[PDB]
Design a protein around this ligand. Structure first.
Ligand SMILES: [Ca+2]
Ligand SMILES: [Ca+2]
Ligand SMILES: [Ca+2]
Ligand SMILES: [Ca+2]
Ligand SMILES: [Zn+2]
Ligand SMILES: [Zn+2]
Lengths: 351, 550, 550, 351
DNA sequence: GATCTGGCCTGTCTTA
DNA sequence: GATCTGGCCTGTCTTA
DNA sequence: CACAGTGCTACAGAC
DNA sequence: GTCTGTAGCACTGTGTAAGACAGGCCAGATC
DNA sequence: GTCTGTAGCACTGTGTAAGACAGGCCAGATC
DNA sequence: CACAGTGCTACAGAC
């Protein structure tokens, strides 16, 4: 366990408090630049490379085949691994754009060509969705499941803006948890089914999803109605059987209380959960390891890296997982005159 | 003594600090009183009439997604940000009036001048109450270098954004035929005295995030407002107004922001036109205005959907510079102020390069260029009485372009053909300037207006001939805008300068004196108080008391 | 109908622009008037009394190298510069009152309070009128970032220097016998309400040539004036004043620069002592004040004439670092304000080093320097409600110095005995601070005063104990000044901080507003009318009216 | 006859509108500087080296046995040529102190030691003046003369502050031309004889003096009484006999009208007057050549180096002669923010 | 080869 | 050996 | 053809 | 014949930070 | 029983650019 | 222990 400071070098104005790291085929790409894309990099996506403490951001270039994506802030990323037909995919949906609206449109982001010289072109294919569309929402989570042997996806959680009845220009900027109905999205075709369950009383937000082998475990998120941070862990088990995707669920004894957590895969299916927060005021310092198996998910805390007094004292913090048990964290920094760089960074690593 | 209205105006309008005022009141009261002025709590109690959230009103049809409660005063503009640590920060402080309410109050304040314009018209009273049309110039402009307060929180950036409107005219249509018939028209729109603040924020123009969060509700107000007509009980009689909103008052950097255009030195120069740098260098004077809201929106949908699987380099040509979703409609119109500043600083640059012989030796150094600036400014001060400048304020931009100043920098350049050239250029400019900067060129300067296109033609031909070395592949945004789309604009509006940024921009000065003298002053309260006190400064009812019928 | 004096006080005391005022007058007069306020032209001849060059006076013995004309008002301070091109140019605008005249006007304005003090004493007013003693604190401090005006001429730098004074006390001695006897003592010397401007200039502090050309006359009348006693006709009778001039209000840099020292970071730190930097490292609390005017003058004559023929190094050792002839005489005293800011910024730096572990790792990287600043200011915003500064105002020094502010930092330092140590330090500081901050510690805070030497001993011991790594060969000027010569100067002047720069400095705020509201506004007249209008702001006669007698 | 534009490199805050350039034994040292000396070079005297357009100023350090000098503004320099026993001398008297005063004390400044690497220690020596002392003054001129064959010195011109009885704090900064009496200063001993002039009914200032072979020519200077800049040139001739140094004088018909002129030596005794101000507004552009022979002064205009429009338009200009027909000029400059260098420079040369 | 002294850069301090 | 991309660094421009 | 000032001096109008 | 209000006079303060594009070339991966 | 003046509340604005000294070391000239 | 504010809300005192 360890952490070391990172200088953001040039161009640290890109990062905003929510953002997303896409780890695919080795190098990982930052996503969700602050504001609208600048023609320095119109694509919107950046390869990130960390070398000798320096954090360098490179301008990706999309393929001509692709649609271009707005810099969504806090979307649901589900990494879909490599298999037929066309590996490997990052399903991004739907976040909220640099204007204030919620996309509610699923994008599929994939690698395309390389290099020639250390260069990677990408392609974004938006997919049409008929339904029973998912309501436009953000901070929900999405996950990839395979039942015999068909692959589908599970979409649940997240806030949305107040429906257009109660919607008022004084309450316009409020949000509310969208209702608790899971959406099963086939990757292709674009059919989105909406089911609900009696076990799910309420909607959540920022609840970290783990997905393996036709089963999906939602960690405790943040419920806005009763303002609890459930220590109840949630599990659900779906199997797709012609011609319906039948779905079940269970509550668990014990689950974590943390919102806005960072899951960095290390082992086969074993992740290290950093966690953003214990409670509304006080952030979680504790670091935790989470494996999962067919019996169930097993939790073991591991000794957290010793935090510099700065990050121990910082009000808010965020980041993403570079994967391979390696992850990035980010600390806002107040200084005058402006740094200008707004965020100190640290790289964290397991074992 | 005197009526509390006259007292209030004689406070608001001479800039007296409340504590300053009360100081004076105690003094006049104690010494030889027979106190004259009215005490503070009775000014405050005379206040509630003038601010919004007071006069009752109703909208036919009812407004979309807007509360029907008409009593709401100054609202914190955060507008329900849930301030959950887990979400985007709540950092920015703001206060705003609920737009419709600010309107009806702003306008019922004109009940005096609208009824007196109606009686000037000798127009029918009971009949034709409902056929009105109201044209509102709104403007939004940002302001930097604003210190902040220690305070209890929340942490907030330095720069402050002030969103304001002004009522340009109000007119009538019914029974029919009869064009439409002006009643009231703002006589000096560029005065601070008429600009109505609406939203006050602490935000940097650069971050788009919080700008759209806090101005989002405002936009839904206008857009939901255009369709409805407003019903106001005035002169005893309820009457229905239509509102026509023109945003004209932005600097271009911010226009470019709000409309998703790439900015601001981008290959696609014109906000109103599709020409690149090079194509605007070739043919300067011939262009047709395309860019507007609806097409920019369809343009973005092309940039995103991208149905033709075209490559980026060329895609950007096909959408012609729209990379982002515009969140507001601004009328396709130029701004007068930064046009004047852009051209002034241009001729400052041409003069500078012209002192030294630029076109003989094309490749000057840093040092000859700094030296050219030194002899230029030394001369301007020596004769034109103009100090060297940090940045080009329009006031030095008005004393810079005159025939006198040019003829004082004519002494500098040895070549006697060039003197002819830049001298004649400047006279061409003075001939076309009033065209856009006067309020209504149709009256004040008609013969310059009819000659504009031909006049700009000799101009561009003169640049592309003699000065070409500087203009070959590069032209400032403003030279292009001003040599191309102005005849089209004054044909569409008839006015440019009246729609200029001044009234917003110039009002910032008030904001600064209201963050110091009449502020609260603590982070929480203080915007509320600058805003209220602004609104009073700018109300007519108070200003009528200034002349006191001479 | 107000007396024109009362009205005038309303005007200058509530900061009302002539045009703002006349606006008010017209308005009140038209409505219900029965005009109350008095017109402009009757105020303009109303204050002819309150300005200088009005009341008649004479010195005996007659002053040296000063004219005998007592009617001279605002004088251009250039004071006869021939402004020939061939000579050293005159680049500076200034205006000043002839010092003596400014004085008799200040005092003739205290005539009221000294007569009511004399009666209160029940000291017979008519008898024993000749033995007065007048103690005048003068202060000179400059100001940056004042933008030049376009104007005509001449070219002038941005920075502006405001030379002022204030009457601290006036007392009496005769018949003999007892001491001398206070009559009047300024009750709040640090108020900008009493700071009397005298000379206003546009000058850069750095150039000595112009600062001494313009202030040269002023000094000459001080040092010609110390000798002769004044004769005023006051309370009906001819009475005579002695004047004791203490310049106490200069900041350190300017003391050094008018005293011929090496500013500001030179090896010889103490303006009042000969100690070097490293010599004042080892020993701290023990020092004896030497440096004084006549001594620095003789010391220059040694540095120049150089009879012993040492090399530069040794010579600079022999005069203890007097490299230049001082011109002005300045009292050997310590400014309170910049003392407060210098100590606060030192503790701010100690905090920064205790956030990280400086004594554990002696060689910190630059990135961790910035990182420590960012967590420190994060902390002080979350608790203590403070926001970082570039240069530190003393008001952030007053929130930083307190013990509960050291509490939010004590939580930052992991180490326990450190966290105790700096906490103990800060309590030492709060115990010694009031000594030099408060007006008269001889009464207000006697026990801190008596314990101060022991208390500072305690402190320096603590420093050289746990902090030595920071203090080994280097100590900030003010830490030394404050741990060494304070008990001495409080014993000497009787009190300190009443003599602080505060009462000068504050007044600068007025010079900014008085350069906008009440400026003329053009280069030529602008200093003239700021200065006049300032003087009127300062006068007691008006503030008396503005009290309104409860 | 040409001018090279010069960069002031670092540290252009030193130079000031009046100043002096001492050319002795090769390199020339600048003298006088804004305000009081700074610890960087406490002596106050800088070596000047001009290489590849760069103007570089270096600290000079005095010998232990020498007095230290205030940075005078506009003194009278007389460069005393090599002979018994002690070359090479610069007689500096008395200028204007930066703390604003006139100093009436006369300094003899000279070379001492080198290098060991390119370093020249100098020695300053005050001289006590037995007299009959000269009134402290500025802009006057002083020149060395040899008659049969002993050597004395001639001091005349300049202004001074208003008579100390008549000087009022309102008229303090006023200044008047001191009375027209010449002071013959023997170098040693300190005897200063004051002598009346039936031919000179007025004093003057800034008058460039050229001294050859027991005769001294005063070129035209600004008179402050009638404010006229006489075209007449004024020659005097000094008779040193035992023990009386009686002095005659004569008026010359026609000469140049100039103030604050720069005399740059070229030939043996041939200096070119480099110009100055002809009137209170217009500054002389024309560059002029002056030989001095026993017959008389031979004066020919010379084609002036073509001036860049900047210096042709400059309000004021100054400089000094580096000798060998080479000299320096300086143009105040404006801008915003400050350049920082308040003065552009140019180097002029003959042939 | 190899000093010396500068020269600049860097480095920081201390004042405003 | 020698491309290509990415890099900064610089050299500009245009708006604020 | 921004606009409301910024103070003082002359120069007219008012009982 | 004093009192009073307004136009001459020259000039301010509010217009203030980012990005785009083009060329070089050195670094560094690819073969 | 309305009217009126003053203390709570937390916080601002005026404190805003230079120089000194120490050590290294590369450039550059004797020798 | 700088000092004069900065506006509003409660909370007392006044016919
Ligand atoms: Ca702007
Ligand atoms: Ca602005
Ligand atoms: Ca200062
Ligand atoms: Ca100051
Ligand atoms: Zn166009
Ligand atoms: Zn000392």
């Amino acid at each position: 366990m360890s952490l070391q400071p990172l200088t953001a070098v040039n161009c640290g104005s890109l990062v905003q408090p929510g953002f997303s790291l896409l780890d695919l085929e080795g190098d990982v790409y930052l996503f969700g630049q602050k504001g609208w894309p600048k023609r320095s990099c119109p694509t919107g996506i950046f390869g990130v490379r960390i070398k000798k403490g320096e954090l360098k951001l490179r301008a990706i270039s999309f393929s001509n085949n692709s649609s271009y994506l707005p810099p969504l802030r806090c979307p649901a990323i589900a990494h879909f691994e490599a298999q037929d037909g066309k590996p490997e995919c990052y399903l991004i949906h739907g976040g909220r754009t640099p204007n204030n609206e919620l996309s509610s449109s699923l994008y599929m982001l994939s690698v395309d060509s390389r290099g020639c010289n250390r260069k990677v072109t990408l392609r974004c294919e938006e997919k049409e969705l008929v339904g029973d569309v998912p309501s436009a929402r953000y901070g929900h989570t999405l996950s990839v499941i395979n039942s015999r042997g068909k692959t589908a996806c599970v979409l649940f959680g997240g806030r949305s803006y107040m429906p257009p009845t109660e919607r008022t220009t004084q309450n316009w900027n409020s949000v509310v948890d969208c209702p608790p109905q899971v959406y099963l999205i086939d990757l292709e075709f674009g059919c989105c089914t909406a089911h609900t369950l009696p076990e799910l009383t309420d909607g959540q937000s920022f609840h970290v999803a783990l997905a393996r082998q036709d089963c999906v475990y939602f960690l405790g998120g943040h419920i806005l109605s009763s303002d609890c941070r459930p220590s109840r862990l949630i599990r659900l088990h779906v199997e797709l059987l012609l011609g319906s995707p039948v779905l079940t669920c269970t509550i668990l004894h014990e689950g974590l209380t943390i919102t806005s957590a960072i899951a960095s895969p290390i082992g086969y299916h074993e992740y290290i959960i950093f966690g953003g927060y214990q409670s509304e005021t006080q952030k979680r310092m504790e670091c935790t390891y989470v494996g999962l198996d067919d019996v169930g998910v097993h939790m073991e805390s591991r000794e957290p890296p010793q935090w510099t007094s700065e990050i121990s004292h910082s009000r808010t913090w965020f980041g993403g997982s570079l994967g391979k048990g390696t992850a990035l964290v980010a600390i806002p920094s107040e200084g005058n005159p402006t740094p200008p760089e707004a965020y100190h960074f640290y790289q964290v690593s397991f074992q | 003594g005197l009526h509390p209205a006259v007292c209030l105006a004689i406070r608001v309008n001479t800039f007296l600090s409340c504590s300053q005022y009360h100081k004076m009141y105690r003094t006049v009261k104690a010494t030889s009183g027979r106190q004259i002025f009215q005490p503070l709590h009775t000014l405050r109690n005379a206040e509630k009439e003038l601010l919004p959230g007071f006069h009752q009103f109703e909208w036919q049809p009812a407004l979309k997604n807007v509360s029907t409660s008409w009593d709401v005063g100054i609202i914190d503009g955060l507008s329900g940000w849930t301030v959950s640590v887990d979400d985007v920060p709540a950092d920015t402080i703001s206060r705003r009036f609920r737009y419709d309410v600010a309107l009806v109050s702003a306008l019922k304040d004109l009940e005096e001048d609208i009824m007196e314009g109606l009686r000037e018209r000798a127009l029918d009273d009971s009949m034709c109450t409902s056929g009105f049309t109201v044209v509102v110039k709104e403007s939004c402009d940002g302001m930097g270098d604003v210190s902040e307060k220690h305070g209890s929180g929340p942490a907030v950036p330095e720069k402050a954004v002030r969103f304001s409107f002004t009522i340009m005219s109000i007119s009538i249509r019914l029974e029919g035929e009869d064009d439409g018939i002006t009643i009231f028209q703002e006589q000096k729109p560029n005065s601070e005295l008429s600009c109505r603040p609406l939203c006050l924020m602490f935000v940097d123009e650069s971050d788009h995030e919080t700008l759209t969060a806090i101005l989002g509700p405002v936009v839904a107000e206008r857009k939901a407002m255009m369709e409805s007509r407003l019903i106001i009980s005035v002169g005893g009689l309820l009457r229905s107004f239509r509102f026509f909103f023109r945003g004209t008052g932005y600097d271009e950097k911010m226009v470019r922001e709000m409309e998703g255009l790439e900015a601001s030195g981008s290959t696609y120069i014109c906000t109103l036109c599709d020409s690149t740098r090079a194509e605007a260098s070739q043919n300067m004077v011939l262009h047709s205005i395309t860019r507007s809201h609806d097409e920019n929106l369809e343009r973005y949908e092309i940039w995103r959907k991208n149905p033709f699987s075209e490559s980026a380099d060329e895609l950007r040509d096909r959408v012609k510079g729209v990379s982002a979703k515009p969140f507001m409609e601004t009328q396709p119109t130029l701004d007068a102020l930064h046009c004047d500043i852009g051209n002034a600083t241009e001729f400052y640059k041409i003069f500078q390069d012209e002192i030294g012989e630029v076109y003989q030796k094309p490749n000057p150094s840093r040092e000859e260029r700094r030296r050219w600036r030194s002899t230029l400014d030394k001369q301007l001060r020596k004769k034109m009485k103009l100090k060297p400048v940090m940045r080009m304020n329009g006031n030095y931009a008005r004393r810079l372009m005159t025939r006198e100043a040019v003829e004082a920098v004519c002494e500098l350049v040895p070549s006697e053909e060039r003197r002819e050239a830049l001298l004649k250029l400047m006279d061409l400019y003075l001939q076309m300037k009033p065209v856009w900067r006067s309020t209504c060129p149709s009256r004040d300067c008609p013969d310059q207006l009819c000659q504009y296109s031909y006049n700009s033609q000799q101009f561009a031909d003169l640049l592309s001939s003699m000065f070409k070395y500087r203009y070959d592949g590069k032209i400032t945004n403003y030279l292009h805008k001003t040599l191309a789309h102005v005849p089209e604009i004054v044909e569409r509006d008839g006015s440019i300068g009246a729609w200029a940024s001044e009234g917003n921009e110039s009002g910032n000065k008030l904001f600064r004196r209201f963050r110091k003298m009449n502020a609260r002053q603590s982070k929480t309260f203080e915007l509320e108080d600058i805003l209220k006190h602004h609104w009073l400064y700018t109300s007519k009812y108070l200003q009528k008391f200034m002349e006191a019928h001479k």
